[PDB]
Design an enzyme around this catalytic site. Structure first.
Site, PDB file in Angstrom:
ATOM      1  CE  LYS A 281     -51.792-114.440 -78.347  1.00 33.26           C
ATOM      2  NZ  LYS A 281     -51.003-113.185 -78.357  1.00 33.26           N
ATOM      3  NE  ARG A 282     -45.522-122.766 -76.118  1.00 36.85           N
ATOM      4  CZ  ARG A 282     -44.381-123.324 -75.732  1.00 36.85           C
ATOM      5  NH1 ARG A 282     -43.254-123.017 -76.353  1.00 36.85           N
ATOM      6  NH2 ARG A 282     -44.360-124.189 -74.727  1.00 36.85           N
TER       7      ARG A 282
ATOM      8  CB  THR B 188     -43.444-110.041 -81.380  1.00 43.68           C
ATOM      9  OG1 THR B 188     -43.456-111.438 -81.068  1.00 43.68           O
ATOM     10  CG2 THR B 188     -42.419-109.328 -80.498  1.00 43.68           C
TER      11      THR B 188
ATOM     12  CG  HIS C  92     -37.249-110.718 -72.819  1.00 36.76           C
ATOM     13  ND1 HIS C  92     -37.035-110.144 -74.055  1.00 36.76           N
ATOM     14  CD2 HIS C  92     -36.103-111.365 -72.505  1.00 36.76           C
ATOM     15  CE1 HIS C  92     -35.817-110.435 -74.469  1.00 36.76           C
ATOM     16  NE2 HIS C  92     -35.230-111.174 -73.549  1.00 36.76           N
TER      17      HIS C  92
ATOM     18  CE  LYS D 101     -48.179-116.194 -74.446  1.00 36.52           C
ATOM     19  NZ  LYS D 101     -48.085-114.801 -74.979  1.00 36.52           N
TER      20      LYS D 101
ATOM     21  CE  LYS E  53     -44.249-112.393 -85.122  1.00 39.71           C
ATOM     22  NZ  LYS E  53     -44.358-113.787 -84.729  1.00 39.71           N
TER      23      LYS E  53
HETATM   24  C1  LIG Z   1     -44.385-114.195 -83.317  1.00 37.39           C
HETATM   25  C2  LIG Z   1     -44.515-115.495 -82.758  1.00 37.39           C
HETATM   26  C3  LIG Z   1     -44.787-115.704 -81.378  1.00 37.39           C
HETATM   27  C4  LIG Z   1     -44.969-114.582 -80.357  1.00 37.39           C
HETATM   28  O1  LIG Z   1     -46.355-114.272 -80.267  1.00 37.39           O
HETATM   29  P1  LIG Z   1     -47.131-113.541 -79.080  1.00 37.39           P
HETATM   30  O2  LIG Z   1     -48.541-113.666 -79.511  1.00 37.39           O
HETATM   31  O3  LIG Z   1     -46.577-112.189 -79.108  1.00 37.39           O
HETATM   32  O4  LIG Z   1     -46.816-114.356 -77.876  1.00 37.39           O
HETATM   33  C5  LIG Z   1     -44.942-116.959 -80.912  1.00 37.39           C
HETATM   34  N1  LIG Z   1     -44.839-118.022 -81.746  1.00 37.39           N
HETATM   35  C6  LIG Z   1     -44.573-117.876 -83.075  1.00 37.39           C
HETATM   36  C7  LIG Z   1     -44.418-119.123 -83.924  1.00 37.39           C
HETATM   37  C8  LIG Z   1     -44.415-116.623 -83.595  1.00 37.39           C
HETATM   38  O5  LIG Z   1     -44.230-116.477 -84.934  1.00 37.39           O
HETATM   39  C1  LIG Z   2     -39.922-114.553 -70.793  1.00 39.99           C
HETATM   40  C2  LIG Z   2     -40.444-114.303 -72.184  1.00 39.99           C
HETATM   41  O1  LIG Z   2     -40.410-115.199 -73.011  1.00 39.99           O
HETATM   42  N1  LIG Z   2     -40.931-113.083 -72.448  1.00 39.99           N
HETATM   43  C3  LIG Z   2     -41.612-112.813 -73.696  1.00 39.99           C
HETATM   44  O2  LIG Z   2     -40.688-112.040 -74.484  1.00 39.99           O
HETATM   45  C4  LIG Z   2     -41.165-111.389 -75.678  1.00 39.99           C
HETATM   46  C5  LIG Z   2     -39.967-110.708 -76.351  1.00 39.99           C
HETATM   47  O3  LIG Z   2     -39.337-109.766 -75.468  1.00 39.99           O
HETATM   48  C6  LIG Z   2     -42.282-110.387 -75.279  1.00 39.99           C
HETATM   49  O4  LIG Z   2     -42.789-109.708 -76.423  1.00 39.99           O
HETATM   50  C7  LIG Z   2     -43.433-111.134 -74.560  1.00 39.99           C
HETATM   51  O5  LIG Z   2     -44.398-110.188 -74.084  1.00 39.99           O
HETATM   52  C8  LIG Z   2     -42.920-112.022 -73.376  1.00 39.99           C
HETATM   53  O6  LIG Z   2     -43.963-112.904 -72.939  1.00 39.99           O
END
Ligand SMILES: *Cc1c(COP(=O)(O)O)cnc(C)c1O
Ligand SMILES: CC(=O)N[C@@H]1O[C@H](CO)[C@@H](O)[C@H](O)[C@H]1O
Ligand SMILES: *Cc1c(COP(=O)(O)O)cnc(C)c1O
Ligand SMILES: CC(=O)N[C@@H]1O[C@H](CO)[C@@H](O)[C@H](O)[C@H]1O
Lengths: 792, 793
Positions: free
Chosen positions: A529-530, A637, A338, A535, A641
């Site tokens: 997100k983080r 992901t 990933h 991003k 959602k």
């Molecule tokens: C789903 C989820 C993520 C992943 O989010 P991306 O926007 O796909 O990076 C990160 N943090 C939390 C708390 C989540 O529920």
């Molecule tokens: C290294 C790492 O945390 N990769 C993360 O993994 C998730 C689940 O595979 C991906 O959806 C996302 O794009 C990616 O930033």
């Protein structure tokens, strides 16, 4: 029934909490209800495990350093069909179940998507009836609690086990010893790793209930325990236990700390022993069938050491011949990649490994030796190919390329999204895939429709069920049936209404949390997100400022109001990310307090973004921001959602965004910016940031505003580092996508002006989100990687 | 009934342990039974606490750094009257109750007698229906586990909470903050302790069931929790939590470590806050005038001494009361128990350390002292020495705070633990003080709980007695005097001895399986079990063992009463001498035990890992109890009382409670020997010349030279040099000065042992006169003359 649940609740409050209704606390009630709910799992938990022993189906082992589990109560109630009854019983007892539910600490043993995927997978695998097990570390402290002090992120220890966890069951009888350091001897009775230091691994089991199906699987998390001056020697026991003390807060970034290497071996060694244990105890040279009974999924390269460890066990302990052991190993392991960013790549210095895991380094060298021996045989005159495929990076201080190790020790390697898996196969590991094309595959990520629909959005789940039945919960592809209601104005109105109730409930949350008057009818623009440069929360910030400026130069212009929410944690040591946070809070302070803009636009930095908060903000979103630079988001992901919960998406053709577009239809998604190819050409041509800065008036103003101290009067150069990065070191080309982005944003507001047309697209989205269920993802893994069959 | 206990047990195994009978483990069963038993406490626990709120009786608070509780299960079953039924239910379920019970980990949050007294007290106070609370620290690690490697004591971490404790209930809602360091600020709003470091204090409640009486009190133990590089900062949280991490393994020895001072303030601050908070929430800015009428805090030795300046600190700095008032209320609130006279046990904290950790408290201590000496000066103008002699501060060299003096001035009552002890404390050690306030100093002879130390550890004896005089004695041990009617009862004496025989047999099996030694079941069991200490004289005992061994060689045919000499006890990790004395015993043991000449005539065993649960095993199987501490060194002792109650005769000096056991049973029924407190004073004056006895007594000289020449350590002839050197030039406990009288006394013992009928006659006279030593009597006197509380039945 209600009567009995109340009896149980009152019994636990009495005997388990040892409390009277006149002195019980809310936490007392939460715990009482939790135990009451757990009791309804026991039978199926014990039964499920027993059944695996009896019918001995092939077991799937998900090995990961992270399990972003969030809260358990409600998720358990729903998956057991106890929510309504518990809701009623708690009600009849004069309590507010939602008040009790908030007492629970998230099990934030993850950083983001990688850790959340494992959590979703655990859910699907249990729902599909697979004999799966989740294996990880029981961190005393998960991802830190983020507070905002004077606009800056502040970290606080996430002491999530302080008051106890009613969802876990310590299994001391399965305790195991783990070895660190020492030296290796190659005696005539096999080689022996001696003079090592030992750390006990105490397992804690947590039930993973499938959705309405009789299955309750297990998540096994290990805790580290210890096996001159007396007092000091006792205190020094803290050093061993420090191994499972806290989760490393990095997202897509490798930090080669020795403690992290220990955590990695700790979980990999305890898990393999336990797996081998259970195997040699199963009803079933004996190890010849190991691969037919065991499957271990490597969640990224973090548990990479599991490969040389299995070999170590197979050879040094079970005394199997290397040839055999290695054959069985490859058949046992499967590796999921990933990563894309070079700084996320795990490259451990051979010196560190040699000192901590001397025997494993040897095994890694052996694997490498035999590996390159093969390349040489096939490509004699290719000398570069050898160094390019070696598990060892001799360049300067030698390092072990954990990904290469995973590729060679696995019968399957997979990406998390078509676009991602393709680059991993054809580009990143072309040399490898060329040899074994069949080894590399794709498994587009997915989210569990339980926690991410039934749980977080009951109103929507109910609406859908009322129109198409509840089959969709176990087969999300059933959501396509919602296309029949495209011309249904009464339905579209119901859909929007559901979203309205979500926004209202969440708006209340915001008003009570933050001192800000939210506009309930404003478009909710959310990017959660983080915090990471790839991003592009920064890109979003330029659009917010760009929007603010427009409001001043024409406060009377017809405008679609917006409540822009941006949340996410920043790795403690990630400077830029922490600077970008300060910027957002800064821009927020100006916008939010300008009497000119007033209720036309509001900016909020969603504090402490985590799984339980995501379940709150996602269902209340109108526009989902997925604007990562093309080629940087392996999949994503959160994007899935939002799509499932009725939000439209504004984003780039990156990660799974591309597939969401394929499903719903590109026209029903707000795609913008350059694609992977355009980013390559711009790279070749070279990136000159100032060009866009000088070429676009809107941008230039934003920049100069930032640079001149407009958003930080008392500190004009506060955002110097940001400005400097934006102009001379932006690998994520923020300015290169600014124009297309802002243009795209305008189109969004336009569609938002036509309620009927907006909810029409939303419906087209929800109706085409079925593919993204983690139930589909797990089915493909089971089918093409693990070779296991689902039961019910 | 049985049927229901089995239902609950099976329910817990299922829902609490989440296990099936086909995969359950013994611990699984132990935990299931424990929960089943705990459930029967809940109603009375909740009810009892509620009742205190409603009738608001005066509450007693036992503040101590140690609570040596041992195991809980059986003690709970017995006190609740559920043993039989529980016994029955576990049997019908086809399980071994003994196997489940031995699974339970000992709660060894104590070192010895001081910590065991609190445990016994908790039991009595609950049995007498007092609104009492036990307050201490929830050490993650109690007293270390002692192993014996190469005849040397080895310590292992006592990870007693590793698998969980089903007897505790964390009460997070009562969590409190504790402050350390920082600086004192002197402003207009007053004095402000600012810039301190905070450590959370998380309480865990454990039920203290009274014996058959509807009362279940509480024992509140506090746990410390925490409120550059991120990871490192998280790991560094271990520093705050290290405060309640492990119990200091010292017995009658002060080790002025800063961590220990932290532990002491930690428990004293969390407890006082909690007490003050419960007072305000009671039914009684705020009015504390009635505090002393509602609260009583018993200081278990000077360890929680800081509780005095802390109450004042709260009263003045927070509640804003005027010093005069606060100080009056304070003295009325506190009572101090002195548990020792050993200089090396005296707590004297360096003012520099206190100033750095507790800056505000040092100030308060100075104030208390100032006002204190201001009083002496007013009364004794020309007495300048009296002032420095009574000051709470020791200016001699590096200034230190005399915690005992602080406790004396901040308490309305100061007590010793045995007549002899209390007398020395009053008239000698603190004469200057008692002279001013005679009435302040009193005595409270220690006692042990007849529940754990009779009903539990010795069912056979308890039953025998009950069959002859009823079970009233369990709640009124003075009833044991009724056993005097069976003095001429030969059938009874035979039953008594039989009970002892069964004890010895059961324990002999234990010994044979534990140690590779063939025990002589008919041999006299000579036992001395307690913490290893020079003042306790296990060394003296060792000389008699060697003295006995030598006699067997010079005449292996001489009619001899066989003996199985057992000596056990833990040594403070840093106590060299004590650890040397252990090595000696194991060394002497190795020779004696393997000499084909002595054979089954004499065996020496070093009882490994001596603790409460093992004491319950070895005590009931003892014939002779060794209580040979130098006269004036054992404040009271309590193991002595346990042996007396379990049918063992006592060989000892006129020290501690030994003197009172003699008063009760009659000196002739006890083997008293050696010099008394007075003789030790005269010998001190005259001066102590060890060699005199060495040269004056052939038996001794041989023993010594044997030790000194390497007879017991061939491969290391000078191994016991340090011992020999101490014995001759630095023995404050005069071992040689009591050797003759001791050995002579020992011979008399063996003689009486030759007359079974006469031996059990004395034993009966002992058991029959041990009633006074019940902790039920002790607690009644405290309640009556110190706490001013009434028992509830
Ligand atoms: C789903 C989820 C993520 C992943 O989010 P991306 O926007 O796909 O990076 C990160 N943090 C939390 C708390 C989540 O529920
Ligand atoms: C290294 C790492 O945390 N990769 C993360 O993994 C998730 C689940 O595979 C991906 O959806 C996302 O794009 C990616 O930033
Ligand atoms: C009773 C007891 C003691 C006290 O022994 P003394 O010989 O009176 O010092 C010490 N340790 C344990 C385990 C006890 O049960
Ligand atoms: C400081 C200390 O531990 N003192 C000990 O206290 C117990 C309990 O009062 C006495 O029986 C004993 O004689 C004495 O040595």
């Amino acid at each position: 029934n209600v009567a009995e649940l109340k009896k149980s609740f009152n019994r636990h409050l009495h005997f388990t909490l040892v409390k009277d209704r006149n002195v019980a606390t809310t936490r007392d009630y939460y715990f009482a209800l939790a135990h009451t709910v757990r009791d309804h799992l026991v039978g199926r938990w014990i039964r499920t495990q027993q059944h695996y022993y009896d019918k001995c189906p092939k077991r799937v082992y998900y090995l990961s350093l992270e399990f972003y589990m969030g809260r358990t109560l409600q998720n358990t109630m729903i998956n057991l069909g106890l929510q309504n009854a518990c809701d009623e019983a708690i009600y009849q007892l004069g309590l507010d179940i939602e008040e009790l539910e908030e007492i629970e600490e998230d099990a934030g043993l993850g950083n983001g998507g990688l850790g959340r995927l494992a959590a979703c997978f655990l859910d699907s695998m249990a729902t599909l009836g697979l004999a799966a097990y989740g294996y990880g570390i029981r961190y005393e402290y998960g991802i830190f609690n983020q507070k905002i002090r004077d606009g800056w992120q502040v970290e606080e220890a996430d002491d999530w086990l302080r008051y106890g966890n009613p969802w876990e069951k310590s299994r001391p009888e399965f305790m195991l010893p783990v070895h660190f350091y020492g030296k290796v001897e190659h005696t005539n009775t096999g080689t022996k790793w001696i003079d090592t230091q030992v750390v006990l691994a105490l397992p804690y089991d947590t039930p993973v209930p499938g959705y309405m199906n009789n299955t309750v699987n297990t998540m096994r998390l290990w805790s580290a325990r210890a096996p001159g001056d007396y007092i000091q020697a006792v205190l020094d026991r803290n050093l061993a236990e420090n191994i499972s003390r806290v989760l490393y807060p990095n997202d897509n970034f490798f930090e080669g700390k020795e403690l992290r290497l220990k955590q990695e071996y700790f979980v990999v060694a305890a898990t393999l022993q336990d797996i081998i244990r259970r195997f040699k105890a199963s009803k079933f040279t004996v190890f010849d069938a190991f691969p037919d009974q065991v499957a271990i999924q490597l969640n990224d390269t973090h548990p990479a050491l599991a490969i040389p460890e299995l070999m170590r066990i197979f050879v040094d302990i079970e005394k199997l011949p290397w040839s055999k052991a290695w054959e069985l190993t490859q058949k046992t392991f499967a590796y999921t990649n990933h990563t894309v960013l070079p700084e996320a790549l795990e490259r451990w210095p051979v010196d560190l490994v040699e000192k901590l895991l001397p025997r494993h380094l040897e095994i890694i060298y052996e694997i490498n030796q035999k590996h390159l021996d093969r390349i040489v045989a096939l490509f004699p005159k290719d000398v570069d190919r050898l160094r390019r495929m070696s598990l060892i990076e001799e360049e300067g201080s030698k390092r072990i390329n954990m990904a290469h190790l995973c590729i060679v020790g696995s019968h399957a390697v997979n990406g998390v999204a078509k676009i991602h898996s393709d680059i991993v196969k054809t580009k990143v590991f072309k040399d490898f895939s060329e040899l074994e094309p069949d080894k590399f595959q794709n498994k587009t990520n997915g989210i569990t429709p339980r926690r991410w629909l039934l749980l977080c959005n009951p109103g929507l789940a109910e609406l859908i069920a009322e129109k198409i039945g509840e089959d969709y919960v176990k087969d999300l592809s059933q959501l396509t049936k919602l296309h029949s209601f495209l011309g249904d104005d009464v339905f579209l109105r119901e859909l929007a209404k559901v979203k309205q109730e979500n926004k209202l409930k969440f708006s209340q949350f915001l008003e009570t949390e933050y001192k800000v008057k939210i506009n309930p009818s404003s478009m909710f623009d959310v990017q959660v997100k983080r915090i990471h440069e790839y991003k592009r929360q920064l890109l979003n910030c330029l659009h917010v400022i760009t929007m603010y400026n427009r409001i001043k130069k024409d406060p009377k212009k017809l405008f679609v109001p917006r409540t822009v929410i941006i949340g996410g944690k920043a790795a403690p040591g990630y400077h830029m990310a922490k600077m970008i946070i300060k910027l957002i809070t800064s821009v927020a302070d100006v916008v939010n307090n300008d009497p000119m803009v007033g209720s036309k636009l509001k900016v909020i930095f969603l504090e402490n973004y985590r799984v339980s908060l995501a379940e709150k903000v996602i269902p209340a979103t109108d526009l989902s921001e997925q604007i990562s630079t093309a080629g940087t988001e392996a999949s994503g992901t959160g994007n899935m959602k939002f799509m499932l919960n009725g939000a439209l998406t504004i984003g780039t053709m990156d990660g799974a965004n591309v597939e969401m577009a394929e499903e719903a239809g590109e026209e029903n998604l707000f795609i913008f910016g350059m694609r992977i190819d355009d980013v390559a050409a711009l790279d070749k041509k070279g990136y000159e940031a100032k060009e866009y800065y000088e070429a676009l008036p809107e941008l230039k103003l934003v920049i100069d505003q930032i640079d001149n101290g407009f958003f930080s009067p008392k500190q004009p150069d506060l955002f110097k580092d940001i400005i400097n990065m934006l102009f001379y070191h932006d690998r994520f080309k923020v300015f290169a996508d600014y124009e297309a982005y802002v243009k795209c944003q305008d189109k969004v507001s336009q569609l938002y002006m036509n309620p009927k047309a907006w909810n029409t697209m939303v419906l087209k989205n929800i109706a085409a989100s079925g593919k993204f269920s983690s139930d589909r993802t797990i089915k493909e893994y089971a089918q093409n990687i693990w070779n296991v069959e689902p039961s019910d």
